[PDB]
Symmetry: C4
Subunit: 113 residues, 4 copies
């Protein structure tokens, strides 16, 4: 059958910026999206360690090394700058792939690296 499963996760990134107007959901440092294998435009979940918020949105490729981690519009509420959040990207898969699979997990720097 088809089970949905943890394909990638950026562990403990700090929320760089945040802007209520103009949208782009979550714009992530290019290096992080490749490291965590994420495609510009991909359902991403966000969990805020500082205030337990939870969102589901697409991800936007930000500049490299900039350690960018921005929440654009709407999610600008709930999640804020200086907030340690977690990014999660699942993926439905055949019960087969489901069994054996190494999720692209990215631990990160206090500066996001």
């Amino acid at each position: 059958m088809l089970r949905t499963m943890l394909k990638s996760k950026i562990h403990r990134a700090t929320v760089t910026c945040a802007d209520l107007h103009y949208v782009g959901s979550v714009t992530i440092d290019a290096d992080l999206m490749d490291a965590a294998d994420l495609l510009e435009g991909e359902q991403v979940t966000i969990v805020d360690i500082d205030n337990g918020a939870r969102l589901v949105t697409y991800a936007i490729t930000g500049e490299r090394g900039s350690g960018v981690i921005g929440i654009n519009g709407a999610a600008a509420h709930l999640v804020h700058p200086g907030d340690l959040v977690i990014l999660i990207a699942y993926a439905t898969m055949d019960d087969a792939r489901a069994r054996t699979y190494q999720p692209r997990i990215v631990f990160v720097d206090a500066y996001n690296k």
Copy 2:
């Protein structure tokens, strides 16, 4: 594998009407549904810029040019008229299509166009 990805998005539309009774989730201007490629009856996500609300519902085809963007029943709370919201529609796809894909993005007029 199958990743879920941003297929379409109506950026910054203004909420035309809103009615708690009688349902139709979100009724969108015909032109917008075609422009953003959305089928009457298709999971659509709404994010309210003015108040950070977040819903998941189907979409209903409204009249053309009427710049209609209505929220019928239930979602009538959370999301309101005069609110700048964002409509998003993802779509699970083969990791292949995933890579190369142009999401139908629709920027819009203060009158929805």
Copy 3:
């Protein structure tokens, strides 16, 4: 590609009962599940017109004509008896089926019929 779409929907049913303890998500009048084409055990979304709540749970076949529409455990909060809610069931499909498809929509009686 595979898009997720409105497969079925029970429009404006009134919440018969509700019990916090012992689980069964939403137990629906048999006739309703067949009418709206729903299988015992199937992700169903609920939207409460009286108070805009929103849940995602499986469905449970209830007795016929009893016009039963119960919310078992957890969802017992959020959604209550005497509440006009809406049940929705999507379904991922090949972009082909997506195009031409008649969603099994069920308008209902003040007594659920």
Copy 4:
């Protein structure tokens, strides 16, 4: 078509621990994950009987018999220790499999067994 359906459910487990910092979503007793057929890394839903909370996250394999059921980071708000919650894992399936299918349901001990 493809319908999403209740594949597995751990009924009435008691929340063992909970830690806001360091992440791992929900860590479940190995035995439970096999019993309920869940793979380390798989979207799981939680519903808190004591406080009607509702989360969506992945599952992490905890130690056996420890009757472990921990909520790591973010979800640490909403859901708490001593809370009777319910774990649910759906799965999209071909309309065929959908019909005939025995969901792996696990009733549990006040000590989680």
